[PDB]
Design a protein around this nucleic acid. Sequence first.
DNA 1: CCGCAAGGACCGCATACTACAA
Lengths: 60, 331, 330, 152, 146, 297, 128
Amino acid sequence: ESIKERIAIVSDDVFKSFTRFSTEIVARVRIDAEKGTVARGGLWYEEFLPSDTLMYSLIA
Amino acid sequence: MFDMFEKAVVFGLYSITPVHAGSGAELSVIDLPIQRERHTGFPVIWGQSLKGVLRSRFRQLELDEKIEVEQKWKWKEKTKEVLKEKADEFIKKVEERKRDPLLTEIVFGPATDGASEHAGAVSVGDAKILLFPVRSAKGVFAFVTSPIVIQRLKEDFELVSEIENDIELKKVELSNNETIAGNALILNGENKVILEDIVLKVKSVIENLVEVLKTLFGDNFFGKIKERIAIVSDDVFKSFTRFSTEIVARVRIDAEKGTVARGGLWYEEFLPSDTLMYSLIAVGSPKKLPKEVDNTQKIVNVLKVTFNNAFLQIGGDETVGKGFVKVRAGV
Amino acid sequence: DMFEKAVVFGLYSITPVHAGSGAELSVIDLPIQRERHTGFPVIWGQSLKGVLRSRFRQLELDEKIEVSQKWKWKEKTKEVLKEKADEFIKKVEERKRDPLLTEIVFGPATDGASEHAGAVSVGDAKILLFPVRSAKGVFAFVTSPIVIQRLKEDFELVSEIENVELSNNETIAGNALILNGENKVILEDIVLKVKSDSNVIENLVEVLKTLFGDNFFGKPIESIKERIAIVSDDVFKSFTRFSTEIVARVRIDAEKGTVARGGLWYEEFLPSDTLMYSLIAVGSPKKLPKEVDNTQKIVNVLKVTFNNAFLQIGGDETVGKGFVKVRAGV
Amino acid sequence: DIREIEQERASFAFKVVSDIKDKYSQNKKVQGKYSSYAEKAPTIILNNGLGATLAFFLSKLEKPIDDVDYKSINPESFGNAENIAYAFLYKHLSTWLAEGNGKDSAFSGLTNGEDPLKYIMEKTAIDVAISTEEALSILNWIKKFAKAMLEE
Amino acid sequence: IREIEQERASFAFKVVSDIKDKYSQNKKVQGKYSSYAEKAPTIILNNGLGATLAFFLSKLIDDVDYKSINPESFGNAENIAYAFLYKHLSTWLAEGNGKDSAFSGLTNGEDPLKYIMEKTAIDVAISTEEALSILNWIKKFAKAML
Amino acid sequence: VVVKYPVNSELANYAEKFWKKELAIYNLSLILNKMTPFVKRRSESYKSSLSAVKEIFKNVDDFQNFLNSVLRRSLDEYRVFFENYERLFNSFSSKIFSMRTKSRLVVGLGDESVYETSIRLHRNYGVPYIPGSALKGVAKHYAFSILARENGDEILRIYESVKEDLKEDYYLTAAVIQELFEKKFDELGAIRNTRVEIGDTVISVGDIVKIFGTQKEEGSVIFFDAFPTPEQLKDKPNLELDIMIFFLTVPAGVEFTFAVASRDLDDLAEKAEKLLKEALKKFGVGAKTSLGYGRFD
Amino acid sequence: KAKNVPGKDTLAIGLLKRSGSYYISLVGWELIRVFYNSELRKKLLEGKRFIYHVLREVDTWPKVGIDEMLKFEVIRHIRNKEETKELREKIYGEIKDLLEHVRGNNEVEKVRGLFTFLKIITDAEVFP
DNA sequence: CCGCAAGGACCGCATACTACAA
């Protein structure tokens, strides 16, 4: 019943937009501890599905 | 019902200096913002940021034989005890910074060269906000939190409860203009609190929350609060975490002209000092082994002894005194 | 994690100090830097490092750095860079890079930024003793529980590297501040009842003796003890807000010798006799000569270079603002 | 959905500045004086204090600085432009500290209806500090609208 | 959140083009508008949206109405550029690209400054973010066209 | 006389005792600025000006003596301050010189005050002093003057474009020179070699640029604050009342210590020193210079 | 792809990474000539950030102001001030030249096509 | 006692900007 007060139904295009452009996009690095700076080839970007996401799978 | 892990430790983090856990430059008025959970706007420190900090510290301690297990931990000897024949070649890799010392790789996983050998034994959770400092008309500042934060804390306790199989280990409603606050924050004869630029009416929970904080971090609070605790609504709390952070203009000065150089003016965000965050550190069975650290309980013990009451630096700008935090690691 | 040594830099203001934070649309056009949630005046680590780095740079380029003998960077660069030494010297002369030891301690200039990190961590300068006008005793050196608590925590950090409750109308103060047989102290516009205590001030003076010795920036430490007051956090907050220096400045139009249009503004200053301190942490250099190839050596260079030195911090340098006396307590 | 004090400050400031412009549209002297006094006021407060500032205004009206309630002051009962402006500024500042922007607004004052000067000369230093900061904040907004609206 | 960016970009391109059109031979005006556009988000960051709008107001009154502003009727480049930026920012918050477009403003035609004085803190926050975003787009086209 | 103090409750009674000499106070700026007397001059008219405050005392002489008696109680602390100030000067190899007030001196007359008049008094020690901003300012404006009287025709001819912006006598020349030094300093190449004597030393326009600096480069000379010697605080009144409306001044015969320092390899502190010395003689510093105030010998 | 473009005479370049991604760019033959002689090529091979920003945000660009946004990204990613002004003018001209030979319905798809091409040939894993 | 009551420069620059095995 608590969830009901915070559900938002939006249009298909708007929902698609949010699921594609509101996911977490995080830069990660690897540090060369010898120099204390970011190592060669040590920078990349990773996408995350946020917490508080509800999904369902049918197990046949 | 969380059988992939066997034990868990909560890492309390109290900032004593401003903290910049960065996410990178943006085309915005705030050029260098801090890490935030996008759908809540809450400041965070991603688990990979914290893991890198914990790994680097643990590694240096093992190389300097400062690691306590059960006496001193001699990683070269234990390496010879485990790898036996090909132990000498492994030690050479470590000295060349190709691999990391034995206990480090057991806990945090192998260096990038041996990534495919096995995974790390511990799971370093994202750090989330528990108490956020907010200036107050009375009492200087308040440790501010909210029901949704208290709720997430209870849910994390449920995680610990499921992992440790301890069922024994397992209500705050507020209007937007209301607060539950300590005596030091309340204006003389008004029953109101002024936090930042918001007037909040005092409502007649804190004592219980403190008792919870006393469980995780011991009877003392990081060597130091109930009088300045303020519980506000979720949205008010959210606005504080997003708009009451330190935003600082920095410059680069031309060493000869004494004037600001081109490409030498930017704005940088900092999580304030006196911020309390926490991360859930889950420990599973090592996947790589000497008897001293062959199971989950022994690894937990090493983690607790190594990082409890220790000081860490997290985020960037270490050289200008940012990111210094005090750690409390309790079960 | 390479930090093996920590030294405390005491900063005692001789002239008013303006560590600026940018202009604002208010009566105080140019305010000083403050910690947001407390409102306490600060000097951010980056502001202090820039001054320390600038000074160290000018001293290294003039062969005035001692490591107890003189330091020759051009000669030490030839021993380090070898074939690429002549190229590096041309970069420094073209101001594209900084001299060797400066880049070792504070980190490389822009062009060499990714080569290695700086060896030292310059902490935020925190308020320790704030000068407040006093009815008796001329002026007092004032602190608060929050300040003392932070001082204590910073020591728990230093020792790790090297391996009081007052109500708003109460104060713990030295005898030189207390009115004749009234047990009251008057600081600025605030009348405070003296609270009987026998440990707080004493331990605080002991701390200052451990760091700075008997020489308290040109005066005996015993002289200061009689004029030290601790007040509540609320009261200290009010002092640091309403007892800073607010200075009206103008620009004169040479035509008539009058104030130009939009030629009147206000600038904020920390007053003279303000005691601030910064934690300078020192780790193993990451770039290097054997003279400065470890933590202890860097510390020794930092101490001798800046101990008893007079440094300008913040803005308005050429009109004589921002000059402090530095003590490097190891 | 709450409001921030800044919103109430801006609202109150616009209202009192518009009130002057309405009551004295033909009087540029009154408007010019009020703007000058609004500009001067925060500096006096920082140097001499809020209490001395409120008393400074009353002394211009030749009122007893100890026996005057702000509500009793009617700016529309003075002759010269100076005293009209001083009366307005004193009234607006006192009203803000005493009543804020209304009893049902997001800020209903600090002195709970008590006359600010009487409040200052009766309460503690911390109470005065909180009122002093608030006085500076409302004056900043009065200055903003006075600079744009009031003419010389 | 993507379509709103396109709307902002469309507005930004339009207002900067109008600046460059009316004052083609006047590089002082173009340069002033550019500088103020760059400084504007900073003023908002350090003083808030309300104060910034008030600051613009002082560069120009009887009532707070962005519609009534006439930037071309001013004497010097400083005031002309200020009046234009002020009207542009206010127009966006109040009208968007018009009521025939996806984004038609936040304040429904009401002057943003008076809007801030009347509405909720939430309403002010979204107006602040939106103001920063449109200025960020104006800065882009300013650097490339002016 | 009836006196009222619009401060917090407990301070009001102590401020009463301070001004009545019933209790000793050790800080001058504190009692002046934060414990302002509102004196009931007549009827229900209260005043906070120095003219009204003077009525608290037997006479003008009594008022002066009180102020200086409060002032002098900082002597011991001020001596240490002044000694560290001298140590500061010598650490920057400053050119240190002392000059004495030839006439009355009042710096900061216009600082906003319920007294309607004011004077720059040190926050902690109460002594009057001269800000480095004023010293740097009066030296630069004096440089503007000498260049105008000696090279006005040529400067106005070479920079006719800048002249049009300003606008045709001396006062127009001085403004033109200022705008050149302040705004259009990239165009000073034409008269960079132009020199001026003050008095036996040769100072070029290019030297003046480096001394005071521009928006593109910091000044090469530090202008420190100027303070009265501790010996005078002990021996003579550092303040006396004057009349225009009463206002505080520094009496004639008060010796101040000045200092300028080079912060560049150019070492221009000597030229700056000679320029400042002349400024303090011919222009004077502080308010009301057109009446002879602020002169030094 | 290539033969499905109106007027055909098209080069279709595909990059199938080992990890699984499949980038495709449709270009006119003259694009190859323009690119090899371009300052842009020498600058790119002297990067990923420039290309990322354009590909990620091109759909937010105004239809009427594509060229101006290209000017901006060149200013932001291409830099003495004498050489900086010249390089920006030259590279912008080259980009405009390259866009003429990219296959696409509109200017947006042409920009996407071009920077998809640039992403392929700057892939450090493919061109070590 | 009266008057005033900020302005422009800088405007994120550079580096790192996947590596490797399974």
